[PDB]
Design a protein around this ligand. Structure first.
Ligand SMILES: COc1ccc([N+](=O)[O-])cc1Cn1cc(CC(=O)O)c2ccccc21
Ligand SMILES: [Ca+2]
Ligand SMILES: [Ca+2]
Lengths: 430, 415
């Protein structure tokens, strides 16, 4: 059941789509109104700062002290309103019997691994746990394109101008001076776009913050004008058959959510300017198979889910209409992780702690290397859990799959490598 | 936007989001010479008169012919309607881009970018077509779901599979269960039974009318991979169908009589995006067919990309312009042969053949696209100097050709 207004609570279980503008209190006004009717309500967000910031707002302005549930900080007050991150909801085990009448999946357009595994978990479990209503809330449903902003200047940036931007040319005036934000697809391009620059400072993170100025930043940032390269760097899987698959990055046209949010960081009350390298954009609503791979990695590394349980939750996500779509590779990734047995627990513990991208994949490749007394695929910091070059310098690397640049010599005959190749044959089409 | 643009007083580019011929009629009625461009001027139904049939102030042609005719001429038209402007085939993209680069200098007052599927469109309900998700319950396995034999036992049915291989296997298992199943794909003709007898057609999109459609909701598309082995790879990937594909497949049921649509996946790719390989096709076709310098091709593609509301692509224009600019002294006779045979990248195939011929080396494989080299006893004599991969390689390769080093450098500096 799709709509622009807060769907009333049905007598029996339903999943409803809520498509409403961002500030219009989908995360605050909607849960409060459900609560004023006497319902216990859960509000899920991808962001820890958002989660923490909703709790804050409702206290400052509203005299309501919600339960707040994040990895870093958990507060229990007994309020009918709970705010939680998707990831903390997953750690809590998902839906616990009878706890909530309503579950709002906020920003349900998010395609990060936890949002998708989280939403999938709600859709698989909410009815059984006694929820009456699941609400799938976003401002930007699948298919969305960016629209006119009343209070934002948008004028095409042309050939003529004095700086090398992105095949186009911003002309002096516009960043001298005042406060200006400039988006680039990469860290490197940030650090020496600014080096060329008028006051200017680069952000992408590792860094904290550094608030007349010109900021040159990736999207890692959480303003008179915005300057937009209109492109983003995205993680994709390549089924490279060398021997198996590769996790790499690709530079794509930004999609609608990207373009709106980048533009959105100007013109907040004060009329602001948006300028661009390129007019068009990807519509919102697609994500990559590498995100499914992330989901299984996280189930295994963080949430103690057998691959087959993760599948059940992600299957719930894919059978649900009006959500971002991706290749159906559930069988394949399930097969892959299911064959990854007896990981070395200490290596897993380190890769998780170290914040690597696929800590299960990293720790498992390191496990194979240790047990074959072979070196990691490179001596990149990804593999530092093997600092102990000395015995495991014995020869070529038994290469399960590609997570980064590979520097060592490699061997492609390890049974796990052959196991994954067989899974590729079994589960991937044409 | 939803109504036909009034003709503006100076040159402008308008968008027409029409719903699911009336339009260029209106314009002509006011004395304006109207040119309408579509991918094809065949009848939409596949049955009926050509759009170009006489009985003018209204010409109907194709992007293909328009490009072959060399584009806009002089002062032939007041209004150019680029119809079906969601099309992301190379010919439509170079054609539209050509209209936009040239129309104003040709004295048109208006260009209309018309489509029923603007970028971001999803498919909408159909009053005449009931949709029912496939479950995992059923005797016939179908893309992770199952078809119950009941819903195709008797009656007439269309099942879409993404590949010809998949069509044959499914049809074979249907026959082994007593169903009248024919497979269809590019290369077959008559085998579909028009006689209202029971039948299930298992086909690709190569494809009477049907009680139901069953859709794998996947498709195959061309992509470029920047694979560094040594340079790039034109390949094919399997993707979730987009909205025009879904709408179109579902649309082969429920015409007149009500119909059923059964699916594997409830959702789609949104329309409005295409691959960098399409750019590559455009430069290939610019050099092979239209006598276009690479920079002239850039100029037409650039005008496309500066136009809002159009399908979006990676901006690899400088990259592709750079590689084709480097492809010098192609053997003219190989070029003729690759053009005539209908290879997909006739310039690239023939250029690779040319570099093989000069270096007296074999082609990457002996699949049919390399047949201009059949004069062979000299030329199977060492490694293949591989410029790029246009298909499966079989031969030993060398990476040491200048042009290979050249393309590699374009990849590093432009991408
Ligand atoms: C840092 O932990 C990560 C990191 C990445 C991902 N992920 O898959 O995207 C998932 C997790 C797991 N995770 C993510 C969260 C979200 C949060 O920190 O509130 C969380 C909370 C408690 C316990 C585990 C939690
Ligand atoms: Ca590849
Ligand atoms: Ca690749």
């Amino acid at each position: 059941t799709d709509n622009s207004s807060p769907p009333a609570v049905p007598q029996s279980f339903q999943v409803a789509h809520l498509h409403a503008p961002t500030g219009s209190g989908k995360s605050t006004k909607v849960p409060a109104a459900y609560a004023a009717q006497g319902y216990k309500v859960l509000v899920l967000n991808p962001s820890v700062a958002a989660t923490l910031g909703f709790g804050a707002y409702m206290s400052k302005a509203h005299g309501v002290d919600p339960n707040i549930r994040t990895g870093v900080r958990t507060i229990t007050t007994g309020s009918p309103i709970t705010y939680s991150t998707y990831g903390k909801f997953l750690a809590d085990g998902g839906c616990s019997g009878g706890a909530y009448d309503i579950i709002i999946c906020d920003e349900c357009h998010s395609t990060d691994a936890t949002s998708i595994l989280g939403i999938g978990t709600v859709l698989d479990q909410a009815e059984t746990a006694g929820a009456r209503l699941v609400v799938l809330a976003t401002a930007t449903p699948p298919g969305s394109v960016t629209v006119s902003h009343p209070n934002i200047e948008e004028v095409a940036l042309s050939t003529t101008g004095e700086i090398p931007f992105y095949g186009k040319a911003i002309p002096l005036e516009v960043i001298k001076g005042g406060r200006h934000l400039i988006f680039c697809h990469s860290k490197k391009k940030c650090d020496e776009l600014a080096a060329k620059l008028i006051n200017a400072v680069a952000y992408y993170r590792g860094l904290d913050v550094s608030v007349d100025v010109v900021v040159v930043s990736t999207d890692a940032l959480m303003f008179d004008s915005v300057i937009d390269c209109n492109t983003c760097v995205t993680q994709t899987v390549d089924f490279s058959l060398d021997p198996t698959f590769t996790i790499e990055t690709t530079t794509l046209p930004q999609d609608a959510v990207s373009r709106t949010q980048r533009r959105g960081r100007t013109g907040r009350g004060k009329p602001g300017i948006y300028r661009f390298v390129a007019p068009g954009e990807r519509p919102s609503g697609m994500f990559d198979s590498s995100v499914l791979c992330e989901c299984y990695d996280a189930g295994c590394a963080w949430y103690e889910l057998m691959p087959a349980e993760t599948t059940v939750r992600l299957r719930a996500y894919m059978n649900t209409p009006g959500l971002p779509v991706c290749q159906d590779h559930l069988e394949f990734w399930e097969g892959v992780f299911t064959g990854l047995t007896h990981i070395d627990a200490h290596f897993l513990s380190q890769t998780k702690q170290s914040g690597e991208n696929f800590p299960y994949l990293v720790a498992y490749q390191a496990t194979v290397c240790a047990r074959a007394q072979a070196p990691p695929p490179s001596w990149d910091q990804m593999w530092k859990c093997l600092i102990r070059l000395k015995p495991t310098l014995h020869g070529p690397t038994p290469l399960l799959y590609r997570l980064g640049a590979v520097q060592n010599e490699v061997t492609l005959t390890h049974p796990i490598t052959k196991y994954i190749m067989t899974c590729m044959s079994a589960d991937l089409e044409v």
